From a paper:
Metazoan mt-[name] P is a multi-enzyme assembly comprising the endonuclease [name] and a [name] methyltransferase (MTase) subcomplex composed of the MTase, [name], and the dehydrogenase, [name]. The architecture of the maturation complexes is globally the same in all structures, i.e. [name] asymmetrically straddles a tetramer of [name], while wrapping around the pre-[name].
The cryo-EM structure of mt-[name] P in complex with pre-tRNAHis-Ser shows [name] bound to the acceptor- and T-arms of pre-tRNAHis through its catalytic and PPR domains, respectively. The 5′-cleavage site of pre-tRNAHis is positioned in the catalytic center of [name]. The density map is consistent with one Mg2+ ion coordinated by the scissile phosphate, D499 and D478. Second, the [name] PPR domain that interacts with the T-loop of pre-[name], further binds two helices of the [name] NTD (residues 61-106) to form an interaction surface for the [name] T-loop. Notably, helix α1 of [name] (residues 61-82), which was not observed previously, interacts with the PPR domain of [name].
Author numbering:
A (entry chain D), B (entry chain A), C (entry chain B), D (entry chain C): 7 to 261
E (entry chain E): 112 to 581
F (entry chain F): 61 to 403
The structure:
Amino acid sequence: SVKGLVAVITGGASGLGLATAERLVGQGASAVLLDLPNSGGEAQAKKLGNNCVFAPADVTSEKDVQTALALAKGKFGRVDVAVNCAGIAVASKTYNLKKGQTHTLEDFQRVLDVNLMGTFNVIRLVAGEMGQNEPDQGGQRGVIINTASVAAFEGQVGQAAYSASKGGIVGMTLPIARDLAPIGIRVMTIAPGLFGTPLLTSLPEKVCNFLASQVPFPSRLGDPAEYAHLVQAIIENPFLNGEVIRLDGAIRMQP
Amino acid sequence: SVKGLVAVITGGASGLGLATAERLVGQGASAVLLDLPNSGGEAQAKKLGNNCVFAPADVTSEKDVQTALALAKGKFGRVDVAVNCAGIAVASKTYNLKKGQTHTLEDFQRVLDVNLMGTFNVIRLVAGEMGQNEPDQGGQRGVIINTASVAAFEGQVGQAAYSASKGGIVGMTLPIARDLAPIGIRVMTIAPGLFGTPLLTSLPEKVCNFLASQVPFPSRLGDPAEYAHLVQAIIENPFLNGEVIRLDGAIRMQP
Amino acid sequence: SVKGLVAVITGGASGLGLATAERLVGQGASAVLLDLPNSGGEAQAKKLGNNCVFAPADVTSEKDVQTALALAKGKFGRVDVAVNCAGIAVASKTYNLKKGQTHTLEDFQRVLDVNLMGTFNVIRLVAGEMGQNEPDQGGQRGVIINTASVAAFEGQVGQAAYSASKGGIVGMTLPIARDLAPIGIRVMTIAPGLFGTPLLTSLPEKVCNFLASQVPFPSRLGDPAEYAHLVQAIIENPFLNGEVIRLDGAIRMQP
Amino acid sequence: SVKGLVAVITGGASGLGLATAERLVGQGASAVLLDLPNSGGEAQAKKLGNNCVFAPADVTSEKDVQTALALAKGKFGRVDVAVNCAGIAVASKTYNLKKGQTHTLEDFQRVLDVNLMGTFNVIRLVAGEMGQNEPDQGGQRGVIINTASVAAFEGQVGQAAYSASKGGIVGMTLPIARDLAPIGIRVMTIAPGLFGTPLLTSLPEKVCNFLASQVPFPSRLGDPAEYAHLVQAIIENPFLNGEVIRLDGAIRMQP
Amino acid sequence: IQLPTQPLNSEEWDKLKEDLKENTGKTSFESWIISQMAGCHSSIDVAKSLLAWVAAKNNGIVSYDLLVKYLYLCVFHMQTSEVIDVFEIMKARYKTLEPRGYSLLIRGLIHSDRWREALLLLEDIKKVITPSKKNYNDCIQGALLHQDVNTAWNLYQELLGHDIVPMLETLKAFFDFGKDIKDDNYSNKLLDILSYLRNNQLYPGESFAHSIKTWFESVPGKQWKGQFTTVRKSGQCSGCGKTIESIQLSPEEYECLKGKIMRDVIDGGDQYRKTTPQELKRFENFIKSRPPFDVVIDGLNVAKMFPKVRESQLLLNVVSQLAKRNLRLLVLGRKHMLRRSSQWSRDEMEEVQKQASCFFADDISEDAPFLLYATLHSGNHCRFITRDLMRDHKACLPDAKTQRLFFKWQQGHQLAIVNRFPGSKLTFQRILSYDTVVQTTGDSWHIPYDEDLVERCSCEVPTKWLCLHQ
Amino acid sequence: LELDKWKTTMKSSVQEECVSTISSSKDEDPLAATREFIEMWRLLGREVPEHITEEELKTLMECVSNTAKKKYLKYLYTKEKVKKARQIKKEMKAAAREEAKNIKLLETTEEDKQKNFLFLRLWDRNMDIAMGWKGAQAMQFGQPLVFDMAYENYMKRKELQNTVSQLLESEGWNRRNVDPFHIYFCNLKIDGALHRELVKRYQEKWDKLLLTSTEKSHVDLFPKDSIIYLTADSPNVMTTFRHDKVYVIGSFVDKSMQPGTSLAKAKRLNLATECLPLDKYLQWEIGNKNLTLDQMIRILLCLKNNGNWQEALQFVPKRKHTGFLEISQHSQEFINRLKKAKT
RNA sequence: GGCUUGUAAAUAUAGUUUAAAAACAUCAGAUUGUGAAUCUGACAACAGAGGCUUACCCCUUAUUUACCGAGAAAGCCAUGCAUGGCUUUCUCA
Ligand SMILES: NC(=O)c1ccc[n+]([C@@H]2O[C@H](COP(=O)([O-])OP(=O)(O)OC[C@H]3O[C@@H](n4cnc5c(N)ncnc54)[C@H](O)[C@@H]3O)[C@@H](O)[C@H]2O)c1
Ligand SMILES: NC(=O)c1ccc[n+]([C@@H]2O[C@H](COP(=O)([O-])OP(=O)(O)OC[C@H]3O[C@@H](n4cnc5c(N)ncnc54)[C@H](O)[C@@H]3O)[C@@H](O)[C@H]2O)c1
Ligand SMILES: Nc1ncnc2c1ncn2[C@@H]1O[C@H](CSCC[C@H](N)C(=O)O)[C@@H](O)[C@H]1O
Ligand SMILES: [Mg+2]
Ligand SMILES: [Zn+2]
């Protein structure tokens, strides 16, 4: 089981991170929802219960993440799991000849800063925090799970920056897994497909229905509870390391 | 939960199949260890309990698999999961210039028949019975979990036939997932790394010890219970479909 | 330069193999179109010129391949390049619930025997003659190229056997490359996408035209001369080894 | 052939970019070595003749890349090929428990800025430049090639940032290929293995010997001329699009 | 080398250092001046002052190396009071002395009355390390000088037990001291000594011979006549004409050698390796089946003599020449030799084979054991032909007496090829028919003493003997 | 004057001894006495160690003759002298490194490699892991090569130590090769002297070595027809390295010559034998035809790597042979003229 | 194709060379910030065994090189016409 574990969930105030926090807290673990101050995460943390605490921090800022980890240590005394679910998406074609429009560098830089650079910042700071944990019977000190996208493998038109960030996460998953092997920290990556989160539910019902039809089976948008269950399974299994799991429902994104 | 499910486990009389059968039966599910008559699976079936039965069959024979599935239906009247964990390993270099030794074609044929052809035969036959099941509330009719190897991606020297068979399994994973998507059957593949099962008895003990020491973390041979836990996680999750999961501990095989 | 090289091309009487033979023989190379007796390859061999010969052999038969290689050695005395382009395609769903139709095992076994078993048979038999060649500057004794398919990565519905065979080829590409690395033989694989050859004429014309329209760029069926150009580029480059090249035109096949 | 083509090579003052410039200019093409002001590229441009020019620009800065492209257009009038070879390498463990040393964030940021952000900046600007080209008989307006690394797949210890950047390039390859397909611009990526460039030749003799022994075959560091030949082959082939080619000699980097 | 024998008054030694350190290597003085001393026996009285100021410089302590060197000097100059004082010095300075320190101590101590202290010191050096032959000689000389015949004999037996060859001076001094006192047990000991000398084959010097004559004449029971004698062509005896030993061996000793070789060929691991046991037993059965043979012919030893001459030709010539003497012929063939070659002619080979039986052995086989066994089985009458010195075989022999008898047999029963020209004729070397060893017959004795002045080489033997009669 | 001086200082020495002996003395085993004995050797200046261990003292006690003890003491003294010299050299090197490091510290130039490093400096670990992977591959597909440790009976302690050292060197050379052999340690008694010394020398790596060790004889593991036992006394001269055969090397350092022991064992087991063609390719001059285990394994590796005899024999010590036969093409001319003679 | 005893002499570096102690080397542990070009450990036996004292000899094994055939003449010496021995010459295989 996961009773007694302490998990730091980035972007845990909404979507996949929130579902993971709910599942883990229901199991019995303790959760630290690390999110932006203007995210409404305080209400969620209050709703979950005493085992859950909200940390206002920006993953792109070293000081903010350090303060969040210090708060987590003070509240619970240790960190056992870290789920990197914070990220943003921007849709923009690389270059549209008809409109004579070019992808702005600012959008690409922002997407890289949030999705990729922030994830690495959290990974390194959490590894530093978890290095203090006493190894368990199996020698494991903690687990780090990252969220990627199938865009890392099959990206669509206008997903240049998003696909770049997710592919960077996928590439860095294994080198870090080798880096932290002597420490005893497992690194895994989940590549969700399409999920019914605010990032997608905001879209008109027509495109949502079309996307639900696209998935081979089940012909529906992914349920965040499924992502939380996969995260829990990764946490429980002591042998999954340095691998990307496509939680996509067999969908291969068309151009 | 998995209580009440009926699972047909090929090669369930030993190793990963036996571990999966043990785990599933311990959770209340029913199991049908489909294995060779001389594998001594009747003893394991008796040990497991009344919920588990033994089916003497050769996966490469259509008649044997049909008889085994008929027996499973007779005893339980339903097939919900199909775990293809039956296979063999052969070590033989493609060509040895120094020794003037050429890889035997019959070895390649036998390895392909047992590993690749047998797995597809089991898939195609079991999908017939899983099609009779009334779809679940989510539309699911059953799950098929194949066993592959990391050799499908990274096969060391003297592993041409085994790597070919596992690569074929990996390749046909997704097409079959798309074939059975309309009838709500999920197809998944697991690519274990190195596990402490009789399959490694062929290799010298020192080689196995070195390879185990070469796993980044945990630095030891995989425990079959871990594979069984991953199989249960795949069964429980309604959204894992048409994917290969590398349960290898982050090990990459050098030449 | 490919002046004086001797190439053995399997399935060289039509399609990609014939295009490769045409390109190579047009640059001073020598070709041995290894094909079935009824393929009508003698006419193509006569057309190509005195530098090309026809070997009636079935890749699935050891004796026929041995006879073809012996004929090639007698006619030219060397075997510098091997190109495995022989293969067949079968379209059949794994299971059709509405029609109650199940994929026949004979078709699957035949597809594996021709596409996969034949390729390995040719590889292992030709490595024997390529081992006789004295190493050249750089230590290369020969080159082996195999024709996989994008189905090995994203196969369509009713493509289980073809995808299995091509995935097996992809998986065994690297193990064989490691096996023959000491000998000094480079092994490469090409995964063509949609190329205009007789293999497509089985598919209805409208479907072929639609698929041609779906290639991102160029929005047309691949030209066999283009595959031949890629093969020549692989031959010339002394550093491409154990890698799969998707000569697909950026297409990603949908279900 | 490549006579008359105009190529913009980033980081063309050394290593792979310089070798590509030599090969293309020797074939009759025109080259614009885009590199840093103090990289000594002016000497290389002078040595390569009148068909090669030097552009002092930092890929990370939009203004400098725009100035370089404007200079290229003024000198030659058009841009037909782009080769992103500029990049830097940084080695640093994610976290060292024994020394209590954490990976610096500025190192990660600058590695991303040079390797990944700069490549995308060049890609977008050069695509805008190529959009004005009149499509040829095949409908092609230009070709873009990127220099990824095998690290993106199996980055070793301490290659977190480098692996992240290269994996980002690999992931963004296909989305950009789909973005520019309507325009008629092919996008390809090359993943070199170990090559005898200043990035490696500066290492001690023993390290170079060990690395040469590591490659399965040929057991030597890759020659930059080989990379240039592969680039030329990609340019000539009108069907290689949205794919990563591993020009690594069948190597799989160790943990 | 300005070396005065006068006291080294302090100031002088100052200059003794200056311009002297570099003069001699290895720190010169304290290491070399003592060696330069010991001349004329006046150096002792001055080396005393040397050591005196050496200690003065020291913190009232003397280097042990200097002390032992002083021991050597004084004992070499026989200062018994100094020996007594230095023995006290050792007692009061070190619980344990040092090798060759014990030697010098005992060499000095012989002249004192504390012989038993020498015995204790010998036992002391024994507890840890094996003492030396010189130590044994020194202590036995002291003990005998102290009239302790029983202990002297016991320590001689101890020496023999430790298996160290004694020094001839020992036994010479033993006899010299015994001169004064006559006893039956003492005479028995002397007879045992002489028998041991005969066994070990060593020859004594002129002083030893003088001691022998003095004692033997001094025996009161029987009057004896002693005189130095010549070999005289192997003539029995230059004076008194007693038959002089022999080249041939007596039948009983021949038989004991036969028994020794039998018990050696049984349980011989090295013999098995050099000569396979199956081949050994095959050869034994061969000889048993065939009758005794008068002569034994060396393998290829004759053939490879005179390299130009064809091996088969020379072998046929020699075997035919011997056969004309109508004796029984045995030849030691070799397995390789069987195969036809340029050297080996099958017609001659088969002619010699039918002429006389032969045996064949492989390369690893050693001829010497076969030849020796064949000769021993044949008996005293037979003879052997060869040129190898048999050094390898005579090695690893069990007993020194057995080695001596083996050497005697090797000299005897041998007819060395002497014809300078094979084609000219065949000749066999003559037999001297005597040796050089004490014989000690009844009522008379004879010893092959060597006159001290001549430096006899290893293979040389003394010319003049000493004779005792009546 | 002087006489009183040395008598009085000797009385002082007596007083020193008595005051030293005033302390309590306990029973001492014989070896302790020998310490003082040995110390006396040190005082004279003989080649004896400053300090000795109890086990070394015992080993000296088992020496049978005086010479053997003298040789052992000289060995010990040489070992101690070498250790002291190496320690002093290491101290000097450390001082040199310290001064050089401070000198470098003075400049503080920085700007090194542009901070542009593709790899971390973990090369030794990578080499070890690569050699491990190669050995693992060889254990499944490598050509067998047998060291039979059945000679413990014929070897003394010094010979055992030398044999173990040579075995370690040979294993290292094979491990660091491009195409390593698969080494079988045959006839290795678990508690035997060789096994104990190997375990003491390899420490924990003994269980991790990628070589097969077994008590069973080589004949029990491979067909009798595929075994060639390499001995210098064989009447058959090696001509060409054969990849289908199993070569057996006698792990035997016979400093005391015992010719034929290896050949004797081979004949007893009824196995084929071969010897290196040294005389055919070298002007031997002066030396011993029997080479060390490391040289033998290096020669075999060179031959297995398709090297010619001229290259393979380069590992024979140069001091033995003056040089290779100038061409050996004269032998080829003899061959071709004789071939013409038949025709 | 000419491959097997024996006598004599000279040498013997057990990872390799040099000198009469050094360099390159070898094995184990160091997740090394790029001089690890290092740190902590392991083995250090001048063919093998006997003695000699302060530096040398006896024996054994191995390697290499020589040694051997005959006729006479010329310059002689010794032993009972014959034998033995040295120096040069050609001759026969
Ligand atoms: N939605 C999908 O189907 C899908 C598919 C593939 C991958 N993803 C990835 O899954 C992750 C979860 O997204 P989601 O679907 O839950 O949408 P979401 O918008 O609900 O999740 C994003 C969360 O990240 C937080 N966040 C953003 N920037 C932050 C920053 N700088 N510091 C701290 N917190 C920050 C937001 O406040 C929010 O809580 C994202 O990284 C997304 O890219 C989503
Ligand atoms: N060298 C290898 O073995 C290897 C292997 C795999 C991948 N790669 C990648 O291949 C590419 C080729 O580089 P290389 O191996 O020739 O090394 P290199 O340093 O010789 O080449 C890099 C070039 O990029 C230029 N450059 C660097 N930063 C720049 C910037 N900001 N703006 C403009 N120019 C800039 C440099 O001046 C230099 O000319 C690099 O991206 C490298 O990471 C190299
Ligand atoms: N010249 C040579 N020819 C063949 N093997 C040799 C050799 N020199 C050494 N060897 C091998 O190296 C081993 C150590 S040498 C020990 C030799 C010993 N006389 C014996 O009886 O073998 C030998 O046992 C043999 O296996
Ligand atoms: Mg002899
Ligand atoms: Zn007389």
